[PDB]
């Protein structure tokens, strides 16, 4: 998914990245041990691939 400005004002955006304390959630909810996220812009861009970490 995506968005870009129509409002012509500056915009402030927040998001998050899930780090479960156990795996049974991770399989049960999302059904991948793979994490790969890519939140991207022109200036900024970053990816995320975390694990369980108790």
């Amino acid at each position, epitope marked *: 998914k995506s968005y870009a400005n129509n409002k012509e004002k500056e915009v402030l955006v927040l998001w998050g990245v899930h780090h479960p*304390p156990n795996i049974g*959630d991770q399989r049960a909810l999302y059904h991948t041990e793979n994490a790969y996220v890519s939140v991207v812009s022109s200036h900024y861009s970053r990816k995320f691939t975390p694990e369980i970490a108790k």
Partner: single-chain antibody
Amino acid sequence: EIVLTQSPGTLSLSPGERATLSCRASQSISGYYLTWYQQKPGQAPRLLIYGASSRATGIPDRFSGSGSGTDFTLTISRLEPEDFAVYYCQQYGISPVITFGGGTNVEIKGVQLVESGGGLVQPGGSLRLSCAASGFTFNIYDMHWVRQAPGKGLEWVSGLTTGGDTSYSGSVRGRFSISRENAKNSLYLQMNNLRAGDTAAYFCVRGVREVGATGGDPFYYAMAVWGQGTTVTVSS
């Protein structure tokens, strides 16, 4: 949520035999969505199966099923006279409404909750019930109040997520009223405008781990655990 239809509501079969039961609805409905129960009359329900495949804790391997979309199915590998019982079909709506298949007798041929207050009232009158919690975190789970006439198909009275999105039926709504307390570890159901449709037994029921907390507690979209229920009746 959608009308189910079990198949059959009662069957008669012999030892050393399988048993196929098919609970199917109006629409096609996504398959980690149903859970499957048994009851000995006199006993409360017990949980067996969920999501058309998979199996609950403390078990043999014989009750096993399949099926998807409109037609969900639980089959059985072997029949035994200890299995003499009515098996049920409970599904979580997306309109967050449990719906109930009407019980399926097998005849074989030759931690805890506590309810509070079941009994009599006058019809058209007023009375309250409660439940109280023992040995867990009543914070987390999505709760349900449920009804059951004797030897009949069930009906679902009400349930509520821990954020506040209620679900009632359009007929039951308003006449009952739920309210919940986590710090006290208890639940409340104030009830008014009561007629003979309520002449039946009820249960308090603990369902779904919402998204998160610490514990050795996974989740399904089935129940967790039940209570022993109690009777309620209008009569004069």
